[PDB]
Design a protein around this ligand. Structure first.
Ligand SMILES: Nc1ncnc2c1ncn2[C@@H]1O[C@H](COP(=O)(O)OP(=O)(O)O)[C@@H](O)[C@H]1O
Ligand SMILES: Nc1ncnc2c1ncn2[C@@H]1O[C@H](COP(=O)(O)OP(=O)(O)O)[C@@H](O)[C@H]1O
Ligand SMILES: Nc1ncnc2c1ncn2[C@@H]1O[C@H](COP(=O)(O)OP(=O)(O)O)[C@@H](O)[C@H]1O
Lengths: 436, 85, 218, 436, 85
């Protein structure tokens, strides 16, 4: 009952580290830097380093998705913690990459990923763990196949780290870390918090709305300029809550024959309801249901009507939440903003300078930055910029880095799809990009 | 061999020895980090000659100034790792 | 024909449904958007089937929710199938004499939002305004939407009445709903930890004035 | 020196208390609740109780205006502190009211103000102190004429308090506490802070701008809806910084004959410059200098031109700052925002719920509130309200309290211009007012 | 008459006596407020009989639970006022 904690979002970006409140570690008698054994759902375990966090609630533990995945749990779930005093320096570990994360990677896995990742870090690992290593503008996942002291150990300087070839297949319950999570969203702290509240009960405790007769929100309208990460938020909320996600793209619907549009809307809601709890995301809502006057067609008006009908046809409906994105409130038909429909709105504004920095770190996680690269400075020269602008900036910076090195590489032959790990993006690359 | 003033604040330190996963654990209090060193030599005489350093992990920090107190070096209730040199 | 007018969420659907139930009449709902979502022709076929089924099961009430979706201001229609639908509606209603004893009720935002030919003489000739509720009304609505909740002693509905002037019934129902869901979230961390009674313990749970304050400022 | 500190604004509303940082009291060896002796300008002293404050800078001391006045200093000045170990329980003190604060007051003074103010509080006082006592919807000032252990003592339960007859005249350097100060402004923390920065050097260290060639701000435009306290801010900044204040009322100027307007603008700037450092406040700027097209007159266009000229005619100007209030930026002629003119803008917005609370406390300081009065509640039901609305609310509440008591008083004769001290404003009074 | 463990944290208390501006100052540490009372009686024998209470000012707070420690009652380096009763 004291060793049981509620899973919460990581502040420490290192996948090995989980965080407790100072008081809680006191209570549990855990050493700062101790190896701890976490127990999750489906009889899964993880081993991690525990550290204190001042901002962590006494009843919560902070962990990165990597560890949440390994424990088959989600934010808000309950795990148990306990010290691991017996843990030995491992003699030898065997790791293999997951196939889908290594397509196109023609590097030396050990030299490029594993060696730097483990070097002098004293990471604990447990057999059957999936961990993530970033580098060369990619992020590779590995599964731990065997540890010498089984089933867990510390990878000490003397621990022999084996791959021994042949990427492995991804099992069903093993969610890719390439999936969108709250980890991939910068500069939306406040709004992301509201959306999480709205959705918590309906998506994580659906059994409740069979036991009671109170109405949770059904439709949430995310507003703000293009490139602000509305699609990202919806996708992330789905993934994190373990809900089914169904995308409806405005233009894709409107591209269809009169009738195949309405048929596609219907199939979307049916499939959602079938796979509930679920989120339906309607990207570019104004393409489908623009201001009542802006429609000229007759089949156009039939489509909007079909959407209103489908919204109304959602009670608890096995627990389906509809999210939709648009530029401005008044860009869409005021009838979707009616009651049993898009009755909740959230404004995803332009990010501030702090947000810009979070976005820049998110979009550089897999790059090697030279020491002269500031990011806080790039934050400061990009006042107008939205997430999509910053991502493009990092992308342009990196491609410039690559071009500079491309003449040099062609000449002393063309390593090409490799030396991308030795390559570093320099502040000069960002300046080049910042003035384009 | 290590003398603890029971009337002063006290703390436990866990040492991870290089030489295998040797886990030693000991009460200290306003002791210096250099006291951890002497405790280590005391418990593994062989190391008396051996050259090693003490550090914390996550992040790696080498405890360079051994004259500091456990309290000053923020090492209350910490794991200290022995790294050979 | 009785035309109920007023802003969304004032309980026009509720009134029509209630009058049906209380008088033991058959109730047939026609939803504007639902009709307009149909293929040209399947609309008119659906209007017809509605009046036929009403008349078959009389005494009956037909409620037309969102009338302006079906029969908007004569100019606002651009379609040709759109104009056929409005015509079809006029025909069906004027074709209901004393009928098998069938009354037609319809809701809309404003008088002027719909085709004036519907406010005709043999058709929607009676209009009734369902306005924004006053502070007394707000209180009745708040009690209605709390009947099945356990309220703490510190909960003052009359207070919540007073800070919700603009609110219509649909707003107040949402308020109570938000209050209750907040009560539940507060208790959800506590419940997950000492295991998850979950779809129970909701009877021992009480919604507190603090829950309403939280909801009132959202 | 360690005993020298910089004067700063009070958090603790009790006039007897000054606040130091925890570290500073440590350093000075002062007891929490100790009587301390403060030394100011013009050989003035004050005695106060010292308390710690978590938010107070180590080099600053927080005190109310009352004590700033007694020490003849202003925010930012330097005082010296020292313990007062010798301070004795006083045998007898003699106090008299300042004439201008007691006009209309036909009460006991001792029973209504002094007795409750001193009762069991253990206030230190020094001969020649002016202190303030609030009550009966007034605030009366008293001067300490004599203390038995001279020149200071503690007014202990056994201390005899004399106030035998004859209000005294106000000396020249003795500023009325009825003057507007920062303590009269609620819910503007951020903006009031900016304005104070802008004005600090030009108004408090004017000699600097003769020693250097850097340009301080000249014109500050305060915008926001009516009743937000723009006039209040300007008046307060003047008072607090000891600058001369000159009001120009838009409508008053425009009410004059063509020519007597321009003559009045000129006289305003001349008189300011003559009495610098000075603030000129232009209330209702849009009455004088509306959007270039909105003027239809020809004398109207001459007036706006005359204003631009007058702004430009302010060089080092000795040290004259022009402040002006308007509803919106776009309501006034854009040439006023040109560089040498109104080049600084500050938005005085609608107050939030915390601000609303500060305003409600400010406008109730002199009332007796019943225990059932919850200002935080009144804060919550007044979302749209601006300062001027809240002040009206308190005023309506108080007048309702008085009407309720007026039938009762007329009948058993009419104490009337008294008994207003025993009267208490109840939550029922505020509800009544809140629905009017 | 009052014993101070000089190995333990320590604080000074200024006692404002009702019997005139009597300013007594004494060192203590993890003593109880009741120890302030004892010290007062010790220093002014005449008051062994007299009925009084201890409080802080600004705001007035009566120190009602005399069993509390100076640390617990947040009275480190405080002025305590004696009020007759
Ligand atoms: N807040 C953000 N944090 C991180 N990346 C972002 C953010 N906003 C946008 N991006 C990046 O730009 C891309 C475009 O964003 P998208 O989800 O399509 O937003 P929208 O739907 O508002 O256009 C995202 O996939 C992501 O790579
Ligand atoms: N007067 C009212 N009394 C009780 N509940 C009301 C009232 N008005 C609205 N509501 C609530 O709002 C919900 C939605 O209103 P609805 O019946 O659709 O009215 P309208 O058709 O005018 O929007 C109702 O189901 C009910 O829960
Ligand atoms: N922020 C505030 N704090 C305290 N009182 C205020 C505040 N704003 C307005 N008031 C009160 O309302 C009156 C109206 O404010 P005023 O100075 O005329 O503002 P404005 O110049 O913006 O119209 C003030 O004199 C004051 O008594």
């Amino acid at each position: 009952r004291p060793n049981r904690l509620i899973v919460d979002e990581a502040i420490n970006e290192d996948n090995s580290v989980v965080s407790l409140s100072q008081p809680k570690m006191d209570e549990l008698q855990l050493f700062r830097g101790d190896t701890v054994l976490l127990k999750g759902k489906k009889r899964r375990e993880a081993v991690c380093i525990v550290l204190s966090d001042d901002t962590c609630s006494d009843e919560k533990i902070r962990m990165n998705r990597v560890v949440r995945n390994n424990l088959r749990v989600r934010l808000g779930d309950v795990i148990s913690i306990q010290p691991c005093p017996d843990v030995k320096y491992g003699k030898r570990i065997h790791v293999l990459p997951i196939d889908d994360t290594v397509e196109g990677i023609t590097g030396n896995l050990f030299e490029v990923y594993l060696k730097p990742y483990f070097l002098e870090a004293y990471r604990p690992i447990r057999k059957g763990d999936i961990f993530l290593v970033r580098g060369g503008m990619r992020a590779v996942e590995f599964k731990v196949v065997e540890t010498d002291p089984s089933p867990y150990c510390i990878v000490a300087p003397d621990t022999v780290i084996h791959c021994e070839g042949e990427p492995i297949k991804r099992e069903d319950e093993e969610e890719s870390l390439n999936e969108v999570g709250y980890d991939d969203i910068g500069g939306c702290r406040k709004q992301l918090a509201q959306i999480k509240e709205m959705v918590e009960l309906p998506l994580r405790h659906p059994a409740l709305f069979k036991a009671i007769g109170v109405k949770p929100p059904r439709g949430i309208l995310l507003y703000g300029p293009p490139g602000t990460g509305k699609t990202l938020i919806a996708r992330a909320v789905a993934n994190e809550t373990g809900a089914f996600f169904f995308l409806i793209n405005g233009p894709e619907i409107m591209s269809k024959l009169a009738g195949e549009s309405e048929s596609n809307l219907r199939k979307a809601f049916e499939e959602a309801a079938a796979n509930a709890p679920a989120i339906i995301f309607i990207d570019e809502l104004d393409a489908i249901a623009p201001k009542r006057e802006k429609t000229h067609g007759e089949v156009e008006r039939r489509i909007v009507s079909q959407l209103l009908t489908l919204m109304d046809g959602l009670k608890q409906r096995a627990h389906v939440i509809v999210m939709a994105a648009t530029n401005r409130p008044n860009s869409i038909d005021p009838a979707l903003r009616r009651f049993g429909r898009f009755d909740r709105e959230v404004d995803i504004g332009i990010p501030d300078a702090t947000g810009r920095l979070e976005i820049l770190q998110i979009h550089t996680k897999n790059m090697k930055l030279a020491d002269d690269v500031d990011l806080e400075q790039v934050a400061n020269e990009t006042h107008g910029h939205v997430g999509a602008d910053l991502a493009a900036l990092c992308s342009e910076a990196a491609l410039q880095a690559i071009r500079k090195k491309m003449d040099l590489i062609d000449l002393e032959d063309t390593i090409d799809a490799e030396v991308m790990n030795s390559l570093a993006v320099t502040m000069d690359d960002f300046r080049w990009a910042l003035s384009q | 061999m290590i003398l603890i003033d029971e009337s002063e604040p006290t703390t436990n330190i866990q040492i991870r020895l290089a030489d295998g996963g040797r886990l030693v654990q000991k009460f200290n209090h306003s002791h210096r980090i250099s006291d951890i060193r002497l405790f280590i030599v005391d418990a593994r005489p062989a190391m008396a000659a051996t050259s090693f350093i003490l550090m914390t992990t996550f992040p790696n920090k080498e405890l360079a100034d051994e004259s500091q107190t456990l309290k000053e070096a923020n090492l209350l209730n910490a794991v200290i790792v022995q790294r050979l040199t």
